[PDB]
Amino acid sequence: GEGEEEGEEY
Amino acid sequence: GSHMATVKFKYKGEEKQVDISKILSVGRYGKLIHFLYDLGGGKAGMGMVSEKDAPKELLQMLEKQKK
Whether residue B28 contacts residue B35, with contact meaning beta carbons closer than 8 Å, is answered with no
- Count of structural domains, chain B: 1
Range of the domain at B37: 1-67
Looking at the partner chain, which of B32, B34, B41 has a beta carbon nearest the beta carbon of A2? B41
- Give phi and psi for A3, each to the nearest 5: 140, 85
Q: How many CB pairs under 8 A join A and B?
A: 29
Whether A3 and B43 lie within 8 Å, measured CB to CB? yes
Whether residue B47 contacts residue B56, with contact meaning beta carbons closer than 8 Å, is answered with no
Whether residue A9 contacts residue B50, with contact meaning beta carbons closer than 8 Å, is answered with no
Report the distance separating Cα A8 and Cα B2, nearest Å: 31
Experimental method: NMR
Report the distance separating Cα B21 and Cα B14, nearest Å: 21
HEC string for chain B: CCCCCEEEEEEECEEEEEECCCEEEEEECCCEEEEEEEEECCEEEEEEEECCCCCHHHHHHHHHCEC
Whether residue B22 contacts residue B6, with contact meaning beta carbons closer than 8 Å, is answered with no
Whether residue B20 contacts residue B61, with contact meaning beta carbons closer than 8 Å, is answered with yes
